[PDB]
A paper describes a structure:
Cryo-EM structure determination of the resulting complexes revealed the effector complexes at average resolutions of ~3.0 Å (type IV-A1) and ~2.9 Å (type IV-A3). Five Cas7 subunits assemble a helical filament along the crRNA spine in type IV-A1, while six subunits form the Cas7-backbone in type IV-A3. In type IV-A1, the finger domain of Cas7.1 stabilizes the bipartite PAM interface while stacking against Cas5’s thumb motif and the Znf domain of Cas8. Cas8 inserts a short α-helix (α3) into the minor groove, with lysine 75 positioned near the A-T PAM base pairs at positions 1 and 2. On the opposite side, phenylalanine 51 aligns to the 5-methyl groups of the thymines in TS positions 1 and 2 of the PAM, stabilized by a short loop extending from the Cas5 thumb. Similarly, type IV-A1 Cas8 inserts a loop to stack the wedge residue threonine 120 against the PAM base pair in position 0. To deflect the TS for crRNA-mediated sequence interrogation, serine 119 of Cas8 and lysine 117 of Cas5 clamp the rotated phosphate that connects the PAM and dG1 of the TS. At the head of the type IV-A1 effector complex, Cas6 is recruited through its N-terminal RRM1 to the thumb of Cas7.4. Remarkably, the recruitment of Cas6 in this position caps the crRNA:TS hybrid by aligning the RRM domains via threonine 224 and histidine 225 against the terminal base pair formed between dG-28 (TS) and C28 (crRNA). In our P. oleovorans type IV-A1 structure, we could trace the single stranded NTS from the PAM to nucleotide 6, while the remaining NTS nucleotides were not visible, likely due to their flexibility.
Numbering used by the authors:
A (entry chain B): 175 to 222, 236 to 345
B (entry chain D): 1 to 220, 235 to 345
C (entry chain M): 1 to 229
D (entry chain C): 175 to 222, 237 to 345
Write the structure that this text describes.
RNA sequence: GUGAGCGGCAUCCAAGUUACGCAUCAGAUUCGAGACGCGAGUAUUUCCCGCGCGGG
């Protein structure tokens, strides 16, 4: 679907001296701004280098309510890594998929998480007996995790 | 600035809905084909969400008076009864374009497309009239939010509220009114009746012969003929309405202008039915920000004296120059 | 199933036969095709057709009435009214002739209820050899409902309207008697009965006719405006 | 629903000598206006600047429908939540979108849900659960100076 | 026994941030549910349409 977006020049919506009272200079500043805007618009119309605040464009989005499939493969992981991925999936819905921060785009909800052909998703989240080992392993790894590994990984030989 | 006006119409209101609708002879709207089907001019309706007592919300058609009609009624009242006499007292004349802009918001169908200077914007928005409505070549935002006329009905309670629940009506408030048209010549039966007609009997017989000639075609236009039996739908008389006017931060002169218009509002019909005296209403209460400023003599009392003083002062110094500047095209 | 009725308001109430003669004289001037079509005359001759005449006449409170049975007769009346109205306007410049057109729907249906109908004028005799069969009411009554049923079937077939196959029409009584005179020069007055009432097992719609010699306008009756019993 | 809007020509409705008494040129100007309108209409119809007469339609959502507005904030301070709740207290004073002339967009807030908790009272957003937000935003406003806005708006080049 | 035979382009990386479809506009002007179904014309046969009988 296509969504149309507009931007307005705030100084053009002033209609009383009260609205321009907060503006330093006030009516004189507003008149100067509007005169410059009119001159720039006339120059651009004739030529057909600053740009004004009036904008009308569109962006194209995927409609809301469509179901997506996300496939994650891991090359022979330890139980700590599987548990970490499961924790991220449990806390993933709080995040947002792509851009569109201002318009609250990218919000989603996880419906089913399938782990090697079996469903491990509950109303609470990724849970069950089959995932206990992964969660215990990742909890132990987190308890034993320190900045030393990151520091060694990020260090440059030269 | 909230204004709520309680209006009771002493004649039916006829705001015709665009489109061609047909009614049978028994009142069946859009009757099945085969029976007699006469054209019906429906009354304006707006579908609104309402509760019928079962606790669920459904969209139901509510007969209203369109808000643009009421806004133009207010504008015409203000002009014809307050501002036109004020300009005539000073012997000030508005140009043809300025008159068009004052009476319809613009003089031509092509907008200027460019903004107005801030000084011009504040000058017009401070004006008692042009500030309320706005428009013009370089489109200006008016201070007036004129809403539609909502009948006090069980269907509008989800909109107007329950403050006026004592004036509500549960049933329907519309009625089919049947109109006709008999041919003048078809009523002539004696030679002395047509003594005024050029040729009298000869002319009448020629005209009815032409009518018969154009009537011979039934099935397989120009000169339909003076004969008709149609109907129109009117909101029945006596129903109490609510009119809501909201004004965006007005000066006392503009409020006084609105109050003067409300004082002289009952002198103009609401909508339609001029030939049949439709649209006659009386204002029953005017509420200004939750307070009732209506008296049997109109809008009076010390609560509104400052508004009247301000509008009188503004009118006593009102010239055509503001209207001429407002209607002037910058292209 | 349409029967076109046209009313002419001459201003003075008109006789049926006198109106027929007057219009025939008036039509004689205008295009002969419409003339022979109007009075059911074969083109080039002046003979009354064997088939059920579809265009006939009739009286009115202030003039004469045109009754065009069937779709064809209705169409003939519809495209013949302007010319006859113009002729009437020419003939009487001292009065304003006014025309209103009433197009009726013709239908007949059967009901178990017995419906009573009244006919103002009835004619039941054409020839003395036929009057030999009319010498008494004993043979007259059978002739009566026979004539009614025959006329109903004839008009139904002429207009192409199916009729209840289980009809039983019964004559009820009489009130008055009159005389039927075909031509001004003819000395013979045919049989005429006034205030005739009969019972029929059907709801009659539109306008029906009974009697003899449809081309004058006697023996007519409107079932629509007569209501029922 | 569809609302049908019409624009009239004032001069066509002008049909009395007193009505044209306010116009410069009097009846001559109105006659010129009407005849020019007639000429333009005839030229446009024959052909197969725009006049004042119009007949349009605009489509609106009916009155009385309920709406859900979802506002999400990532890791806000107390002052920012207080500012949002203050805006929601005075939000009904402004219209949603479009139709300023015809008073469109008016609404009333039925409920405000604050992370699963309803904080809407008949007199606005009130309660002990919202007291700290209002206090924080009040303090922030009392300490609000234009230097932040000026620094924000100043270009770096 | 093909200048043959043998040989991983592979690993790692956010298209994101900000933006009012808005301002202005009479569904108006004209016209009747009120008119329309016969008490209209003599005595016994005349030219003819289908063929004793139906029928101008």
């Amino acid at each position: 679907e296509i969504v149309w977006t507009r931007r307005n020049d705030p100084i053009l919506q002033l209609g009383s001296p009260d609205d321009a009272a907060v503006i330093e200079g006030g009516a004189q500043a507003a008149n100067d701004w509007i005169t410059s805007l009119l001159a720039t618009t006339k120059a651009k119309k004739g030529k057909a280098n600053g740009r004004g605040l009036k904008a009308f464009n569109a962006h194209e989005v995927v409609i809301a309510g469509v179901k997506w499939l996300w496939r994650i493969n891991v090359d022979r992981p330890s139980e700590s890594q599987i548990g970490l991925i499961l924790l991220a999936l449990n806390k993933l819905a709080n995040q947002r998929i792509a851009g569109g921060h201002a318009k609250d785009y990218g919000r989603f909800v996880i419906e089913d998480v399938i782990l090697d052909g079996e469903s491990v998703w509950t109303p609470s989240g990724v849970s069950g007996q089959a995932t206990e080992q992964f969660f215990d392993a990742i909890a132990e790894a987190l308890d034993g995790m320190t900045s030393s590994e990151f520091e060694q990984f990020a260090a440059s030989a030269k | 600035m909230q204004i709520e006006v309680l209006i009771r119409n002493i004649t039916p209101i006829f705001s015709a809905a665009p489109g061609s609708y047909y009614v049978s002879l028994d009142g069946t709207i859009n009757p099945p084909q085969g029976a007699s089907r006469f054209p019906l001019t429906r009354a304006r309706t707006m579908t609104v969400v309402a509760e019928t007592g079962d606790g669920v919300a459904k969209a139901v058609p509510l007969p209203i008076v369109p808000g643009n009609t009421m806004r133009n009624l207010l504008r015409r009242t203000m002009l014809k009864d307050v501002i036109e006499p004020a300009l005539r007292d000073k012997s000030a004349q508005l140009s043809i374009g300025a008159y068009a802009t004052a009476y319809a918001g613009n003089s031509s169908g092509n907008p200027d497309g460019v903004p107005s200077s801030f000084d011009e914007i504040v000058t017009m928005r401070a004006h008692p009239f042009l500030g309320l409505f706005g428009g013009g070549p370089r489109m200006l935002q008016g201070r007036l939010m004129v809403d539609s006329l909502y009948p006090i009905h069980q269907f509008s309670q989800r909109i107007i509220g329950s403050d006026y629940i004592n004036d509500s009506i549960k049933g329907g408030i519309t009625e089919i009114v049947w109109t006709r048209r008999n041919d003048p010549i078809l009523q002539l039966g004696s030679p002395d009746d047509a003594a005024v007609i050029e040729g009298g009997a000869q002319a009448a017989n020629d005209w009815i012969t032409s009518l018969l000639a154009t009537t011979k075609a039934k099935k397989g236009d120009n000169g339909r003929g003076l004969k008709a039996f149609n109907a129109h739908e009117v909101v029945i008389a006596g129903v109490k309405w609510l009119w809501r006017i909201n004004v965006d931060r007005p000066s006392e002169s503009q409020i006084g202008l609105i109050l003067l218009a409300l004082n002289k509002l009952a002198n103009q019909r609401i909508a339609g039915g001029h030939a049949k005296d439709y649209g006659r209403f009386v204002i029953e209460d005017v509420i200004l920000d939750g307070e009732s400023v209506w008296t049997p003599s109109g809008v009076s009392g010390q609560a509104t004296e400052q508004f009247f003083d301000a509008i009188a002062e503004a009118l006593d110094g009102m010239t055509s120059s503001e209207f001429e500047q407002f209607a002037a095209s910058a292209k | 199933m349409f029967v076109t009725q046209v009313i002419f308001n001459m201003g003075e109430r008109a006789y049926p036969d006198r109106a027929r003669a007057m219009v025939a004289e008036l039509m004689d001037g205008v295009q002969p095709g419409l003339v022979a079509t109007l009075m059911n005359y074969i083109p080039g001759t002046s003979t009354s057709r064997t088939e059920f005449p579809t265009v006939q006449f009739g009286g009115a409170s202030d003039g004469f009435c045109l009754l065009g049975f069937g779709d064809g007769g209705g169409a003939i009346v519809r495209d013949a009214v302007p010319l006859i109205h113009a002729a009437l306007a020419r003939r009487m410049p001292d009065r304003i002739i006014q025309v209103e057109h009433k197009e009726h729907s013709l239908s007949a249906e059967a009901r178990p209820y017995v419906l009573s109908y009244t006919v103002p004028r009835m004619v039941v005799q054409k020839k003395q050899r036929h009057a030999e069969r009319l010498l008494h009411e004993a043979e007259g009554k059978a002739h009566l409902e026979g004539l009614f049923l025959r006329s109903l079937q004839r008009q139904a077939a002429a207009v192409g309207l199916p009729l209840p196959e289980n009809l039983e029409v019964e004559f009820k009584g009489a009130v008055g008697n009159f005389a039927a005179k075909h031509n001004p020069n003819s000395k013979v007055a045919y049989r005429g009965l006034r205030g005739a009432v009969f019972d029929v097992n059907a709801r009659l719609g539109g306008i029906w006719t009974a009697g003899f010699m449809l081309s004058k306008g006697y023996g007519q009756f409107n079932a629509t405006h007569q209501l029922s019993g």
